[PDB]
Amino acid sequence: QIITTDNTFVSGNCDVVIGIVNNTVYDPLQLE
Amino acid sequence: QIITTDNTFVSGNCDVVIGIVNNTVYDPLQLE
Ligand SMILES: *[C@@H]1O[C@H](CO)[C@@H](O[C@@H]2O[C@H](CO)[C@@H](O)[C@H](O)[C@@H]2O)[C@H](O)[C@H]1NC(C)=O
Ligand SMILES: *[C@@H]1O[C@H](CO)[C@@H](O[C@@H]2O[C@H](CO)[C@@H](O)[C@H](O)[C@@H]2O)[C@H](O)[C@H]1NC(C)=O
């Protein structure tokens, strides 16, 4: 599935998770 | 409860599920 803000819950600062990867998540709110 | 896009998740093509029923779902984003 396309990784949207409904599929995922966000909590962190992108410096503590070992193995995190760079990608763009999608939001259904900005478009509307 | 009123069938909204958060109560349900969408995945399919309306042609493979046996017993599907025509109805309208609701989304809280189009109004806003
Ligand atoms: C994911 O993307 C980040 C920015 O969108 C990257 O941060 C950068 O990190 C470099 C050094 O790695 C800095 O020079 C730069 O200023 C910025 O902070 C991040 O590195 C990147 N990580 C991966 C794994 O792609
Ligand atoms: C649910 O609603 C669909 C359209 O909103 C219906 O599709 C139609 O199917 C007929 C043939 O039955 C076509 O002639 C028409 O062009 C349209 O594609 C669908 O049938 C309907 N299903 C039920 C169970 O009511």
From Swiss-Prot, chains A, B:
Gene: S
Superkingdom to which the source organism belongs: Viruses
Glycan attachment sites: N22
Role, per record: Subunit of the fusion protein that is processed upon entry into the host cell. Mediates fusion of the virion and cellular membranes by functioning as a class I viral fusion protein. Contains a viral fusion peptide that is unmasked after S2 cleavage. This cleavage can occur at the cell membrane by host TMPRSS2 or during endocytosis by host CSTL. In either case, this triggers an extensive and irreversible conformational change that leads to fusion of the viral envelope with the cellular cytoplasmic membrane, releasing viral genomic RNA into the host cell cytoplasm.
Organism: Severe acute respiratory syndrome coronavirus 2
Protein name, UniProt field: Spike protein S2'
